[PDB]
């Protein structure tokens, strides 16, 4: 699992 703030991709 890579670390991502989930802000500019569709995180849903």
């Amino acid at each position, epitope marked *: *699992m890579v*670390d*991502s*703030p*989930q*802000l*500019a*991709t*569709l*995180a*849903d």
Partner: antibody
Amino acid sequence: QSVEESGGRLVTPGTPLTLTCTVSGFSLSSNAINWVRQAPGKGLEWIGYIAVSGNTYYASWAKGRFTISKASTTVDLKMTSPTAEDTGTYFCGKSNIWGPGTLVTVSL
Amino acid sequence: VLTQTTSPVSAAVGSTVTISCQSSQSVRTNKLAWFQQKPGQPPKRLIYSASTLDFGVPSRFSASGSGTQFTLTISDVQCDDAATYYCLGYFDCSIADCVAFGGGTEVVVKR
């Protein structure tokens, strides 16, 4: 689905205050959570986030002043040593999902 | 630093507005989003991945860009679009902050 912040209130400078983001309708195991804030009248400011792994990341200006952590259903934002500059609304969330915000006041 | 069109931008109902977002440092991948905020209310995302509309968002909204130039276009401006618009980008952590918001651009409805 949603999130909700709480714990904002008036405190004196230096009083280590913690805010809480409560997840509902989704999982912290598959989702990341961000803390954002806004001084009254000013613009939005990114503070930091916590990945699904548990790894925290912070804005340069926020390092030392702020600490994020997560339990099973909640994410905390510990303010280490608040000053009057820290007054504002604080929002938790990611992407689509943002709470109504909780209002922190720092003053004597 | 993400720098945005200087507030306010005023436009009449039915008109078009365009808001720029310029980065002093190139944005990661094409990981940029556009948010709308009305006073007292939390931010709502309009665009993610630079071009892609979120679910439930009016087709009046459009966006483009890459590297260090991004643009949000509001066609057929409605009274409903009176708000402040913020761009947000990803960057390499260990060169700069992972995430940054722009300064925000306020939209006024000409009347």
